[PDB]
Design a protein around this ligand. Structure first.
Ligand code: HDD
Ligand code: HDD
Ligand code: HDD
Ligand SMILES: *[C@@H]1O[C@H](CO)[C@@H](O[C@@H]2O[C@H](CO)[C@@H](O)[C@H](O)[C@H]2NC(C)=O)[C@H](O)[C@H]1NC(C)=O
Ligand SMILES: *[C@@H]1O[C@H](CO)[C@@H](O[C@@H]2O[C@H](CO)[C@@H](O)[C@H](O)[C@H]2NC(C)=O)[C@H](O)[C@H]1NC(C)=O
Ligand SMILES: *[C@@H]1O[C@H](CO)[C@@H](O[C@@H]2O[C@H](CO)[C@@H](O)[C@H](O)[C@H]2NC(C)=O)[C@H](O)[C@H]1NC(C)=O
Ligand SMILES: *[C@@H]1O[C@H](CO)[C@@H](O[C@@H]2O[C@H](CO)[C@@H](O)[C@H](O)[C@H]2NC(C)=O)[C@H](O)[C@H]1NC(C)=O
Ligand SMILES: *[C@@H]1O[C@H](CO)[C@@H](O[C@@H]2O[C@H](CO)[C@@H](O)[C@H](O)[C@H]2NC(C)=O)[C@H](O)[C@H]1NC(C)=O
Ligand SMILES: *[C@@H]1O[C@H](CO)[C@@H](O[C@@H]2O[C@H](CO)[C@@H](O)[C@H](O)[C@H]2NC(C)=O)[C@H](O)[C@H]1NC(C)=O
Ligand SMILES: *[C@@H]1O[C@H](CO)[C@@H](O[C@@H]2O[C@H](CO)[C@@H](O)[C@H](O)[C@H]2NC(C)=O)[C@H](O)[C@H]1NC(C)=O
Ligand SMILES: *[C@@H]1O[C@H](CO)[C@@H](O[C@@H]2O[C@H](CO)[C@@H](O)[C@H](O)[C@H]2NC(C)=O)[C@H](O)[C@H]1NC(C)=O
Lengths: 669, 314, 669
């Protein structure tokens, strides 16, 4: 860490200098080439930027700790997992997928959840998503998916969005994507925060024990903050009012001592069970339903420290599934296999040189011993002058590590191969439609509506008639109902039911709106709409504040202008900034009326928006009975709150915050 | 231009190949290092990105032409300006300033208006803004302005916005910025489209005649579509509903045969007049009011062709 | 520093691994993409190389220290010079100019001598040559000089040599080069070692005192090992027998506790004296003769520590004249001015990124305080989150440093400008011929012959008749005699004398052969030619060894095969490996064939040594007679014949100090 709280300005080589005026030939003359102060400064600036990540360019990171719950030697040799209470430092970056690095957090997308464990046996990375399955079955297709999903290559439109022709052209021609597509079209595509979503490794990996035996595994990071998501119409507005919403959220949660937590869990099954669930476990388009393999909680992951320099830490972190430790191994998942190549090659693009593992954030916490040398940006001075193997001149050091010596990584010895070298897809990968259906069946009826609606939204922006038809064809193969309802919005006939993959099987834990109330309401944001006219209004506010802040909520009092007790103005305020909204009684005048200090109708607009997006809304005070009829909000409606007793208003409101979304306000087909 | 409307897939060295399945050691086996089809394709993908521009990362471009209205030998030796009706191909890119790639077009910012004339005497670039004056008086200060205006370096917040402490800390400590600040806080901060804004060179330049004599000049690109701007509360929503608004707009105007146009104009004054208007003409925080030096229309700039590949061109 | 003397092989992120066999699908099967051990290792290897330096690609470096002799506050504000006995660590790299990084050390070239002082006020670099003047008067011409001097762009021939058409086309068309060209054609073009050459800053710089006043200066680094140089015919062989000669020499000198030393000196003159010596001091093609400004010894520079990793230290060191400290300033030397731009720009090519000053070898020894951020390979984590000026949010830190605060660098306030902006050469720069003549006049008659011979050698390799004529024209303007003698070798008539610049002025200190005996003979190499037949031969050798090694010499006993007391075989031996050669009496048989060395080798070594002007001798009884067989005159200067071992050494050591016996070389008539 470099401290600049005191001192005089120096060059990068420590010579004291100034940097405010160019060196000129006369007070009104031209600048001199010999002005090294100028050039060193501007050269640095000119070279500040590096290529953004090819995918997941938009994201944010934090420091934390992983703690093991036990000694898991019975399932894996992995050292970070070998003792009860063992603590490994971590760094996690969350991201969206398609958007470039300045795009909105709240676009609809799959989300990245990438975790580095800095273990005492090397760095170990789990590079996953908030959605447990992926669009494609072979890594070689990654550029096809990503090309089609990103902006059109002629005009680079649209940013951060699947709502254009090429994406759906791809989805409709590559049916493997149905499952992920359904996930992304649910609320999983627009989470309320990084803290309110899960992490998944997607691929099946292997646990390996010192005796060389292996089980097949799936990683799950389950959120202790619960599952929550935005509604589309709210996410759209948020993207404009606050492109930084998710990163501000994570930053804030950590600053206020509310670090988010996840249970790091696995599903464990036998090698013999590769095909025992009606699909191939090497297929990254499928989940093992919880019904057939329960989750084991391995340890606790907690984020509790924000970075100091975003660029140096978040932007430079370079994850790799290649960063593997003794106790884990890969599987023949053709998606996972290709990823191994990609993540090593891409960092050359991003770092511009081969020594990217030497950046502080990428360094391990244990010693390095190997014969890698040179390369641009070499930061080490190697003492071993015989960097070859086998040598006698350095006494045959460094020694080879393997199964039986030095705790070397080793491939699971059970793994075998047979047959021809082929560029052919396994027939066991061919069912693209069952699991999407399983997923859809497991959602509440409103969740289903929202999913249909997301699809209606996007498909209607697809210009090509032929592409829309092919979309309906694939959708129909998952559910005729879904096809029909989607087709209705784009004025086409859904094709005739095809029931080859229809079924009524459900699975638990994939639903957001059906996962019951949030386990905690700490850090949720409450907006209090007040005024500077009535002296009573601000007093009501101040009292709600004390009571709400006591329960860990984040309170904003809104008024026409700033002063003591007021956090922000109606001008800068918006419903998307709040999880619930409270109007204090004394502000009734404002909801019934114009001001040069905010746009017309703003105070009411905030409230009405909050209600229409399914949020806990309420009026607190005497004339509360009547402020609602003016606002056109039903007094008896679920999650609408009307009370005089401050203590009983809070108590009622806090129940609404836990329910989080009031689903009765949304029309069904 | 490379055509791919017919043919079989080839490597970059023209060997016909496939790219849909990895080469595996058995139908349910691991992928082979020797699969050159895979590695050449993924290597390309892994390396697609280049660093975004340090400022003006968010922007869009179009092809057009410039036509001279006269032989301007009386004021400059500049060849693209030396004949009535002389056509020079152009390429223009418009942009915002602070936002990264992917930030919304309708953030509040200064805007870039950058023109290349591919003249018969070399490429000539006028790299300007939609606002005729700039925040600072010395280029050595550029990183201070830009650091303060871009997101906070600890958390990269906020994107594409001067609405935070550091920006105003800078503006309040570096008063030279008041003029541009005022412009950016007007509707000039949030134009209705690229077509409904002007271009300015900002700095004073010199016209030079073959005899060696020089006048001082200021470039103005006056919009023939007129000036229009959004309202804030509208701009905010638009940033969410359509981050691509300005680029969609320009693309569409061109597709539909309504290419935007600008009169390329200059103010011309004498070397002796450097300090005759109550400020120094070397000061890029100042305009010469039209009341003291009228504009001369030099020619017409028109954009009428969209690019074929955004990356390769824009 | 990274220690690898013990431990198990790890990846760059510390995971223990092996690196000797690829992961294969079956014992006789193809290699797997998932083999991360393989790819990380090979990626590193594939990326080990960086671009070589655009010029001075072939060089070598060492660590040392500089000691000040006094408090020089009376002439400069420069802190590393502000106290008697003040020590500053240094790093120096010496080089040739034209050759690529694998070319021989002993090509004929100008030589680099670049010094970094890691001062307590910032890094300060003096980037100089072994020759005090440069070919051209404006930096903008540097690519022209270098293109013409390097290999031809069609076939890339010849390596490391001015002996081709383009070089002499340029020299003949750009007469400014005469002066340097004469130096390079002297023995200065082929120094005996880096240790036996001087360093020069070339340009006039300024010393600046805290009161703002300035003197004009010239840096001289005078060698405490004395000046010595090879002869051409010897250099050519050495290039083949040992491309690494100079670097070997420097390495060895330092390993054996004989670190080379230089007196760091300046010439100091007044601003008013800019044109007071009959040339413009801004002209880098001119010297201030010692007769008109004596040298002041400022301190001692000593090299005493070899690097640990060549690549990491020597290859990655990045010098810049822009690395200046308070107390020194630039002058309007149009060559110096351009260099300021180049050296900052070129490091982007070499390092591939803007953070090159963060490489350990380039870091300063004091803190860094500035607002430079980000860039590829950013190795710091900055704590100051308000990296702009002016700020209040970091209390206006870092503070501007200048003349009166913070010990800032500052431009000499006396410096002024006037007139028009012009791309024109000052008329004061127009005399390209006098100083070369001054130089030539100041060499011993043999030194003159050698220079003529070097010119005869090269010009005869110039294919083009027209270019040869234009060369003669330029040479003639310096000296008719030189033109005449050179013309004689290429069969052309020298043009008629032109005396505009002829004169007989001499200057001291520019001659090598006339600089008297060496002040030390420590580290010089002596070859003893012996045999394994006569038991007496090896006993003679062993006794010479003890005696010679006692005086700091490096001794090699040569025989047909190796054994105790024998350092190398006749097979691997050559005259170029020795500064003097001794045949022991008992080996006479060998000098009058064997499958253990090429025919005639033992005599070839001796005869070569004699013909190249080296101290040669036979030690023993029948010494009288071994010489007549060898055809070496017994009475000849630097030929030694004695029976008394103690007397032989004593005589021989005088010859080693004389170093070269110039009476063996024919002169013109
Ligand atoms: C064959 C190419 C390829 C394939 C099939 C995948 N990825 Fe990937 N991914 C990349 C190629 C890539 C990449 C181009 O190599 C990136 C971009 C920058 C980087 O570090 O690696 C990347 C980045 C990246 C990041 C950003 C990490 C960060 O924050 O820096 C996450 C979270 C993921 N990926 C997650 C996945 C998941 C869950 C996948 C499905 C199993 C997946 N990727 C398939
Ligand atoms: C000392 C540095 C510096 C200063 C004082 C300025 N600029 Fe700049 N500008 C840059 C350094 C820079 C740059 C970092 O060099 C950029 C970024 C990428 C590039 O190609 O140049 C750039 C980009 C850039 C672009 C984008 C062109 C494109 O779309 O590719 C425009 C229109 C401008 N600038 C215009 C200006 C104007 C009108 C200025 C005030 C009169 C100005 N810049 C001051
Ligand atoms: C503007 C072009 C230019 C001009 C006129 C010069 N140089 Fe230079 N020099 C460079 C541009 C350059 C360079 C291309 O930037 C190098 C190559 C590698 C590097 O870092 O700087 C360099 C390398 C270089 C090195 C090697 C440093 C090392 O060992 O790493 C020395 C010793 C010199 N130069 C010395 C000089 C002297 C004594 C000159 C005459 C006064 C001179 N150069 C003129
Ligand atoms: C592997 O080891 C852990 C050791 O704790 C086992 O987990 C425990 O299982 C018992 C019942 O068998 C529970 O009462 C404990 O609470 C569990 N502890 C934890 C931390 O979960 C685990 O069952 C073993 N698994 C296998 C397959 O052998
Ligand atoms: C858990 O893993 C750690 C790290 O690998 C083990 O501790 C290291 O063991 C090696 C060799 O056995 C020692 O030479 C190191 O000094 C150890 N490090 C420390 C901090 O003790 C540890 O033994 C493992 N524990 C279990 C129960 O298997
Ligand atoms: C719907 O659910 C049933 C019951 O869970 C599934 O039937 C099981 O499938 C597995 C895997 O092939 C068999 O080995 C089990 O023994 C079956 N159990 C029972 C009770 O029938 C069925 O596969 C599911 N159908 C779909 C389309 O997912
Ligand atoms: C430079 O020459 C142009 C070229 O004609 C002059 O512009 C013309 O001015 C007259 C009236 O003064 C008009 O009839 C023409 O139509 C003008 N043409 C254009 C394109 O403006 C111009 O006035 C001259 N300017 C100077 C300063 O000498
Ligand atoms: C306007 O500029 C063009 C381009 O410089 C001029 O035409 C050139 O004139 C030169 C020298 O007289 C010819 O050798 C070139 O071949 C011409 N180039 C081309 C592309 O045609 C023209 O003379 C200029 N017109 C005026 C009025 O000054
Ligand atoms: C600057 O100060 C130094 C410090 O002593 C002077 O160096 C001495 O000069 C006197 C002659 O004037 C000699 O007797 C000493 O032997 C010198 N010592 C050294 C180490 O050089 C130096 O002369 C002064 N120079 C000027 C220009 O005032
Ligand atoms: C010689 O060298 C250093 C130049 O920095 C001086 O020591 C510094 O002196 C100032 C006092 O003015 C302090 O603020 C610095 O912190 C000191 N630095 C170090 C590294 O010791 C010293 O003053 C100079 N001596 C002379 C005689 O000028
Ligand atoms: C040869 O040496 C003489 C003697 O110093 C030089 O003539 C002097 O030059 C200096 C500097 O220009 C003048 O101040 C004197 O007036 C001259 N002195 C005498 C005594 O004549 C001459 O410049 C030298 N010539 C060359 C070509 O180097």
């Amino acid at each position: 860490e470099v401290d600049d709280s005191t001192g005089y300005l120096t060059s990068d080589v420590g010579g004291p200098i100034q940097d405010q005026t160019s060196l000129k030939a006369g007070i009104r003359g031209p600048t001199l080439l010999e002005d090294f102060m100028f050039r060193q400064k501007i050269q640095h600036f000119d070279h500040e930027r590096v290529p953004e990540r090819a995918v997941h360019a938009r994201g944010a990171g934090a420091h934390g700790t992983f703690t093991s719950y036990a000694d898991w030697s019975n399932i894996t040799a992995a050292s970070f997992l070998n003792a009860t209470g063992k603590q490994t430092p971590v760094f996690v970056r969350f991201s969206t997928v398609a958007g470039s690095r300045g795009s909105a957090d709240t676009a609809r997308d799959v989300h990245g959840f990438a975790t580095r464990f800095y273990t005492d046996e090397g760095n170990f990375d789990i590079v996953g998503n908030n959605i447990p399955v992926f669009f494609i079955q072979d890594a070689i297709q990654f550029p096809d998916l990503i090309h089609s999903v990103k902006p059109r290559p002629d005009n680079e439109i649209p940013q951060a969005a699947t709502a254009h022709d090429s994406a759906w052209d791809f989805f409709s021609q590559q049916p493997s994507t149905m499952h992920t597509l359904f996930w992304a079209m649910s609320g999983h595509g627009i989470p309320r925060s990084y803290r309110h979503m899960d992490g998944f490794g997607v691929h099946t990996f292997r646990f390996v024990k010192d005796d060389g035996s292996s089980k097949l595994i799936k990683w799950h990071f389950k959120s202790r903050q619960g599952k929550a998501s935005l509604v589309w119409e709210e996410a759209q507005v948020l993207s404009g009012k606050n492109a930084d919403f998710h990163r501000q959220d994570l930053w804030d949660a950590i600053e206020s001592g509310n670090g988010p937590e996840w249970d790091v869990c696995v599903q464990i099954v036998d090698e013999s069970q590769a095909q025992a669930f009606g699909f191939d476990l090497l297929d990254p388009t499928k989940i093992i339903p919880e019904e057939y393999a329960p989750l084991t909680k391995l340890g606790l992951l907690k984020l509790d420290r924000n970075p100091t320099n975003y660029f140096a830490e978040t932007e430079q972190v370079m994850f790799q599934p290649g960063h593997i430790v003794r106790g884990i191994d890969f599987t023949e998942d053709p998606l996972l296999q290709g990823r191994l190549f990609s993540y090593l090659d891409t960092q050359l693009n991003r770092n511009g040189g081969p020594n990217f593992e030497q950046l502080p954030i990428n360094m391990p916490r244990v010693p390095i011993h190997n014969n890698n040398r040179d390369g641009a940006g070499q930061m080490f001075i190697h003492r071993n002058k015989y960097p070859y193997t086998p040598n006698t001149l350095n006494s045959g050091y460094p020694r080879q590590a393997n199964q039986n010596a030095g705790r070397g990584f080793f491939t699971a010895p059970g793994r075998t191969a047979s047959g021809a070298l082929v560029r052919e897809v396994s027939p066991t990968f061919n069912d693209h439609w069952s699991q999407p259906r399983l997923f859809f069946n497991s959602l509440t009826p409103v969740e289903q509506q929202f999913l249909v609606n997301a699809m209606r939204f996007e498909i209607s922006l697809v210009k090509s008639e032929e592409v829309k038809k092919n979309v309906l064809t694939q959708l129909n193969r998952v559910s005729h109902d879904v096809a029909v309802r989607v087709a209705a919005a784009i004025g086409l006939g859904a094709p005739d039911a095809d029931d080859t993959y229809y079924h009524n099987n459900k699975t638990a834990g994939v639903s957001i709106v059906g996962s019951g109330p949030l386990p905690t309401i700490k850090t949720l944001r409450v907006g209090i709409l007040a005024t500077t006219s009535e002296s009573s209004a601000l007093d009501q506010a101040a009292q709600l504040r004390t009571r709400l802040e006591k329960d860990g909520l984040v309170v904003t009092v809104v008024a026409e202008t700033l002063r003591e007790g007021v956090d922000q103005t109606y001008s800068t305020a918006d419903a998307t900034g709040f999880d619930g909204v409270v109007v204090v009684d004394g502000a009734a005048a404002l909801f019934a009326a114009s001001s040069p200090l905010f746009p017309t109708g703003r105070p009411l607009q905030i409230f009405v928006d909050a209600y229409r997006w399914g949020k806990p809304v309420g009026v607190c005070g005497g004339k509360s009975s009547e402020v609602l009829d003016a606002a056109d909000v039903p007094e008896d409606g679920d999650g609408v709150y009307s009370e005089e007793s401050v203590d009983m208003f809070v108590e009622e409101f806090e129940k609404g915050l836990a329910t989080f979304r009031f689903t009765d306000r949304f029309a069904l087909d």
